[PDB]
Design an enzyme around this catalytic site. Structure first.
Site, PDB file in Angstrom:
ATOM      1  N   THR A   1       0.800  -1.095   0.032  1.00 50.20           N
ATOM      2  CA  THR A   1      -0.007  -0.069   0.099  1.00 50.20           C
ATOM      3  C   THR A   1       0.937   1.305   0.006  1.00 50.20           C
ATOM      4  O   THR A   1       1.897   1.194   0.475  1.00 50.20           O
ATOM      5  CB  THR A   1      -0.742   0.058   1.107  1.00 50.20           C
ATOM      6  OG1 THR A   1      -1.580  -1.167   1.223  1.00 50.20           O
ATOM      7  CG2 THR A   1      -1.942   1.444   1.291  1.00 50.20           C
ATOM      8  N   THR A   2       0.564   2.178  -0.757  1.00 53.66           N
ATOM      9  CA  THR A   2       0.935   3.532  -0.493  1.00 53.66           C
ATOM     10  C   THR A   2       0.025   4.492  -0.986  1.00 53.66           C
ATOM     11  O   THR A   2      -0.718   4.545  -1.935  1.00 53.66           O
ATOM     12  CB  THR A   2       2.344   3.603  -1.425  1.00 53.66           C
ATOM     13  OG1 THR A   2       3.222   2.735  -1.293  1.00 53.66           O
ATOM     14  CG2 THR A   2       2.859   4.731  -1.096  1.00 53.66           C
TER      15      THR A   2
ATOM     16  N   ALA B   1       4.571  -4.728  -2.491  1.00 49.97           N
ATOM     17  CA  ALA B   1       3.038  -4.620  -1.888  1.00 49.97           C
ATOM     18  C   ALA B   1       2.321  -3.457  -2.426  1.00 49.97           C
ATOM     19  O   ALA B   1       1.134  -3.308  -2.112  1.00 49.97           O
ATOM     20  CB  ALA B   1       3.020  -4.568  -0.263  1.00 49.97           C
TER      21      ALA B   1
END
Ligand SMILES: COC[C@H](NC(=O)[C@H](CC(=O)NOC(C)(C)C)NC(=O)c1cc(C)on1)C(=O)NCc1cccc2ccccc12
Ligand SMILES: COC[C@H](NC(=O)[C@H](CC(=O)NOC(C)(C)C)NC(=O)c1cc(C)on1)C(=O)NCc1cccc2ccccc12
Ligand SMILES: COC[C@H](NC(=O)[C@H](CC(=O)NOC(C)(C)C)NC(=O)c1cc(C)on1)C(=O)NCc1cccc2ccccc12
Ligand SMILES: COC[C@H](NC(=O)[C@H](CC(=O)NOC(C)(C)C)NC(=O)c1cc(C)on1)C(=O)NCc1cccc2ccccc12
Ligand SMILES: COC[C@H](NC(=O)[C@H](CC(=O)NOC(C)(C)C)NC(=O)c1cc(C)on1)C(=O)NCc1cccc2ccccc12
Ligand SMILES: COC[C@H](NC(=O)[C@H](CC(=O)NOC(C)(C)C)NC(=O)c1cc(C)on1)C(=O)NCc1cccc2ccccc12
Ligand SMILES: COC[C@H](NC(=O)[C@H](CC(=O)NOC(C)(C)C)NC(=O)c1cc(C)on1)C(=O)NCc1cccc2ccccc12
Lengths: 222, 223, 222, 223, 222, 223, 223
Positions: free
Chosen positions: E1-2, E180
């Site tokens: 996730t970002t 991710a």
């Protein structure tokens, strides 16, 4: 412990051994593990004796309690669900050693066909259940030997008497391969207990009949 | 265990295997794991049997309870949120070994286009959910094999029959690579259960068509 | 895994399934678990694959090693003792998960009566062994189901052919109740492996014969 | 990590992705995981990078060592046994986190028919091995997706080139569902590495060919 | 996730990737991690999906709840405090693995200068928060790569479009170094989601513009 | 983190650095750790950020709450006991990692001598407290360095400005030997925050003034 | 700690910060972490000081030992293999807390093209290594910030001077976000150490040039 139950045309039979053990020591020879819990259902339980007896007793009380309160007995599905909820209730203690598993045999008076109205329900420690479509089932430390025997002997089941024979022989093989299951004691005259359930209800199988079937099996094996 | 569900034009199909195990031992051959939870929704669950059946039963009761109280069924989003809330409720027990994950397949009667009104929703042990906009999904110990099989077989789905066939075939690959998933038992005549849901509602697929699709795939693989 | 062995008049038969698993996942369908270790003995092993193949290979080498060094093969008792010592050597690793149990079937060329020269020996993780006097024995996660099947089908063993049939049927029941045991795969045409041993020695049973017996058993059950 | 190998008429192919990770972090994009270990065998390794490279290096050295000492290469079975003994040697460190599993592809010059002389051998952490007769096999974090892809794509293998395509496509599906497996990087021009082995020996597949197959697969998936 | 958020003259922008993972496995490609929580506020969350979505949903419900009860929306400080209290509430579950951190972007309609009315607030698992004046901020497993990218690209931000571009490029670098975090999928046509907030409120950036910028950056790097 | 407080004739000064860290990583440069809790009291806190701000806010609310309810502010001793009880209340969470220690600086309007009305009170994680009868104190990971610096520089404190200077210089030495304490950032123009309290009340020292003092110290250290 | 290395046309540059810590406490300002290990290779190490310096010393001795014994220096691959083997040897102690990772920068005198003869090799705790094609690499608690900075600044590298400037700026950003990495100390005049390696060998970069670049970067960031 080993308890067997099988479906025959128009009924069901359940039988259980008589042995009680504490580890390797034999603490009982006459113990009864199959109880008539209602006019059309019997329960056999394996595991800690205290827990098993409380199960059968409290279960019978619950069914008849509903029957007197509401004027009609529970549907068979209801009986199953109540037994399951009880079993799952005991899960905490079971994880701590007070484990007890029941096996339910009944005759569903509301079933379509009076010949396939027999019902066999098995349970696990978390309350899960399965209605057995295959005709036989067992529970206890000798259940695998008894199921594997009945797998070979089941084709011979055509009426209540042949079914009772196959049940007692299954208990015989179970006791043959498991020290925690007691076989027939010809010296003391102690044999498995059995219950038969058909359209007329549930009745205890008399000791003498089981005796004759036992001696027949023993002399068949010699 | 493997439960599969996929969308076809105008509906959805869900099918599940019949095997129950205690470790390595097979404790059941006829077990049913896919349930119609309401007139337009079916649920299949994987995991501890007790928890799975309690989930399905309680969920069906909860939905119809709302419908009789308020005179209208829940929105599909509402059904999703309730199933999720139930799972998250079970998370604590699940971490002690009583794990159960559901897969939801339904037909949204309030959707704009009735062609794409099918819905497939997957869940994780913490109550998370995903509405699948890619057509198929699976859950259980064989779910990876089923998803990877459908990845190649999904382009062939054009009707209710093609979708049902692809579903049972996915369960076949799952049972081929996962011993906890039961394949078709041709001796006993035990096959996966399937439910199909379209604009006319949710119906159990009759056992005969499942047997025909099974035996058809089995023959299809023998050279 | 399930390995079965039974004595028939004038010989012995051993058969084993073909499945390899990693937990729940099927990692192999063609796996071979029964090996001819010398002209008159076969060994089948259950447990960690690496340890099992290592046992069979090293054991065959050890027997032939003694045979070439001293000019005469070991007595059957000697073969038993060497296999036992190997198992007892692995005990430490076995407690750490690398467990492997063997089952030994042989024909004792030095026996008094050639019709009862068949030998079946079973082992435990600590190296204990028992020469099996009841005619049949099994090992593996499905061994209990197979033993209970043979208990009922053993009366039918009168020659090599009936004995082989009973062996394959025992493996069938094992695969039927144990997911870690593989049944006959009619789509891929993969069937259990078998070894038959009589006065002429030990030979691999051709797969096509096992197949014919498989279809006979399946058909018999429908 | 994902390494695939499959048998084609008269030969064998092995290919591996290019990604190296530290948990979630990408620590490498160009790493090589499939090595030519001798004139007729290639090895691909999955797991801890250090242990994997040492496996490949030491194994090649051991084979050529035997060849120079005794004047003849090992039989293929001998090669299998030596690699297995090496892995079992690493078992303890594997228990402490330094796990590495190999996948072996070879061409047995002593085989009966030079048509099915390809060999694919898989290994487990304890040194167990399986010679794969079903034609394909994979190892790594994406091996299940790749195996399930090849299960559907294998019928298209008719020569070395179709087999190579199927290998790259399997690696594509693997990278598609596994974040530890790297797909083709069209920006940097980095693609899986491949080795082809037939009666003429084992040769590296040229980068250009794999790039062609990759782009064909991508633009086949984007309509 | 970002998740990234940055201030531009007269507004703020927030963008987030689309990937959902279970360990190493990709379990989602289209998820939405950036939500419009009210007419002048957007929230993006990283961490366990269930906890993240429940955060966004419950937070929107809480804000609108206060607005309808008291006839006026919460002051921005108040919104910050409620989000912080929520995050602190989850601390125990976070300590057992259900961690989720939000990132808050808003336009303060009560601000002194209408050009510096953008607000970016970051949070930690214990309910701590920081109002970011450095102009940009990020959260998630790739947040360091995105922040370090924006440290170099922020000087190029002069309007809403340049700011949106810089955000998408930061997510590009994040996905470039973090497995991710998902990058732009040109095959499936799935791109990060973005929300823009100025004096006219918070509106979703249409997918087309983000796709255009993603392609511009990609072809810019080849 | 480092917070210092010292008494000067007729007042008290408290200052704190601006750095926030997550392990080795710098997560904040503009942070505020010293708060005016009432017209005559300031609190500086070290430890977990969330717990610290909750302490400052809740404490200020508690004091002003008492003041509005009973019409008169608490005696200084009462304020001490309230902060102590709050700190003790947090002991359980403190053991599990949410530790926060305050430092209390105030001006007691009910003191006999208005030149010795300054008060500095320190606290421990279990709620113990000590009224500091020696003119200075500090708390935080650099508190030892700041205390040892002030031990040498305290002779120079004669008014508000000299005391403010010794305070900022103590923060300079603290940041000099402790990486969790931030020194003056001349590039971004971020300097410690300070609060000064005398008979006229408690006021924030302007950033520009501390900037001047920082530059003065830096020049003094360059020769 | 942060150590950076980047390739510039015809050479390689390596630079490292000067800060030494015991937890949060700064125990050193002048430490050297980049060492010239032979005429064409330098190594910078991050981690436990004792283990790091022992690595550098022992490695230099091992290389020169081979050269004097055999009359010729090791091939670069050989140098890599020996450093990797040393790192692997330390694994047991490393898992007990004495971890140290090196970063190797060298000039391969046997390379074909002297413009691309620069070599940068990184290592992990298990002895794995990667030869960096991407052109730059870093190691240490600030390595991620420095790498992400160089990712944007690398296009500006055209000769040794631009390369050195990019290295120092990377260390500046690392120290900006990592408290365990020290930035330029203008009061004490302590700056990162650097080594540059081209065809004429490896030389220590004089301190004055690093100071000039530092002041240039600092002014570039302060308007
Ligand atoms: C798997 O475990 C075996 C089990 N044994 C048992 O359940 C035994 C029972 C026993 O021996 N009691 O002694 C007397 C009362 C008979 C003198 N528990 C224990 O001894 C026991 C359990 C705890 C806790 O502490 N002690 C068993 O026998 N189970 C069989 C069983 C089934 C249904 C009804 C029964 C009623 C009485 C006795 C046995 C019954
Ligand atoms: C734990 O993963 C395996 C799981 N097994 C199981 O869930 C089994 C169920 C079982 O074997 N019951 O035996 C009877 C009831 C048939 C006599 N639980 C347990 O063995 C169990 C767990 C604990 C704790 O105590 N007992 C399983 O097979 N699950 C499959 C499954 C999925 C959906 C609906 C189902 C409904 C009925 C049966 C199975 C169902
Ligand atoms: C532990 O009970 C399951 C056991 N499985 C196994 O023993 C598996 C074998 C396996 O799956 N390997 O995968 C490939 C690469 C070889 C295909 N070991 C392990 O999973 C294992 C054990 C340790 C330690 O690390 N890995 C098994 O199936 N055992 C059956 C078996 C018995 C005799 C000879 C055999 C030869 C080959 C394969 C199986 C054999
Ligand atoms: C097991 O997890 C994943 C594994 N990663 C890894 O193994 C990483 C490799 C790594 O990132 N090194 O950094 C440098 C060398 C680039 C500076 N080591 C570790 O995580 C590690 C573990 C211990 C203990 O010490 N280090 C991997 O990516 N493996 C893939 C892989 C397979 C075959 C050959 C390879 C050669 C080089 C790199 C990768 C290779
Ligand atoms: C482990 O941190 C990674 C995290 N992953 C996850 O949160 C995954 C999500 C997942 O795969 N669910 O399965 C379905 C429903 C998609 C089929 N759950 C778990 O790992 C999980 C946690 C527990 C306990 O049990 N399962 C993540 O991806 N987070 C990203 C994320 C952030 C904000 C909103 C999101 C909404 C949907 C999906 C993801 C979202
Ligand atoms: C644990 O000693 C280090 C401590 N750091 C911290 O406390 C950090 C702060 C942090 O990074 N928050 O993120 C944002 C909001 C800044 C982006 N949280 C944690 O380490 C943390 C602790 C738990 C549990 O979960 N996260 C600290 O720096 N404390 C110093 C400090 C003292 C007084 C007031 C403060 C106000 C804001 C920030 C810091 C303050
Ligand atoms: C723990 O990671 C941080 C590490 N710090 C350290 O390694 C410190 C070094 C230190 O402060 N020593 O004090 C003296 C020598 C000044 C008296 N050791 C320890 O804290 C330590 C570890 C054990 C065990 O016992 N003590 C570090 O700073 N590493 C950086 C570093 C890298 C390369 C060469 C270096 C040479 C000298 C100093 C530092 C060097």
């Amino acid at each position: 412990t080993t308890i067997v139950a099988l479906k025959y045309p128009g009924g069901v039979v359940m039988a259980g051994d008589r042995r009680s053990t504490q580890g390797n020591m034999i603490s009982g020879r006459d113990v009864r593990k199959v109880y008539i819990t209602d006019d059309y259902t019997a329960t056999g339980i394996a595991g800690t004796a205290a827990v098993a007896v409380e199960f059968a007793r409290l279960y019978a009380v619950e069914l008849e309690h509903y029957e007197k309160l509401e004027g009609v007995p529970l549907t068979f599905a209801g009986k199953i669900n109540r037994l399951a909820i009880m079993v799952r209730g005991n899960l905490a203690a079971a994880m701590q050693g007070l484990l007890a598993l029941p096996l339910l045999a009944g005759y569903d008076i509301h079933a379509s066909d009076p010949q396939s109205a027999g019902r066999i329900v098995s349970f696990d420690a978390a309350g899960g259940w399965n209605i057995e479509e295959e005709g036989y089932q067992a529970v206890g430390s000798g259940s695998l030997f008894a199921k594997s025997s009945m797998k070979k002997l089941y084709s011979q089941v055509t009426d209540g008497d042949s079914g009772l024979r196959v049940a007692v022989e299954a208990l015989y093989d179970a006791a043959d391969d498991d020290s925690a299951t007691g076989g027939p004691d010809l010296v003391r005259g102690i044999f498995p207990t059995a219950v038969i359930i058909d359209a007329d209800g549930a009745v205890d199988v008399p000791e003498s009949r089981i005796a004759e079937l036992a001696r027949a099996i023993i002399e068949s094996r010699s």
